[PDB]
Design a binder for this molecule. Structure first.
Ligand SMILES: *[C@@H]1O[C@H](CO)[C@@H](O)[C@H](O)[C@H]1NC(C)=O
Lengths: 48, 46
């Protein structure tokens, strides 16, 4: 079926992967939740 | 990928969207741009 992705890869249209993977992005959110739950707003202003 | 001309002349070359194994310069467009068959260890990234 060739899907559409490498149908588009032919004729020279390519998608560059994002610099940050999905896992690390989720890791960033997890850290934000931990700071909010355990430290409230303090971690944003300075030391948690 | 270059550290900077002032810092050094060594360079790193990334071939986008290809396996290292099937299509290296070891076996090609830009032939003078060879960087040898194995200039260093080849690393297959996403
Ligand atoms: C081509 O690259 C993919 C992803 O890097 C890899 O899983 C696959 O094994 C490579 N092809 C071969 C024949 O190894």
């Amino acid at each position: 079926a060739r899907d559409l992705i490498c149908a588009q890869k032919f004729k020279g249209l390519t998608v560059l992967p994002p610099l940050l993977t999905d896992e690390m992005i989720a890791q960033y959110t997890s850290a934000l939740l931990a700071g909010t739950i355990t430290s409230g707003w303090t971690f944003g202003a300075g030391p948690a | 990928i270059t550290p900077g001309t002032n810092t050094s002349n060594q360079v790193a070359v990334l071939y986008q969207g290809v396996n290292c194994t099937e299509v290296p310069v070891a076996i090609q467009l830009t032939p003078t741009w060879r960087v040898y068959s194995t200039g260093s260890n080849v690393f297959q990234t996403r």
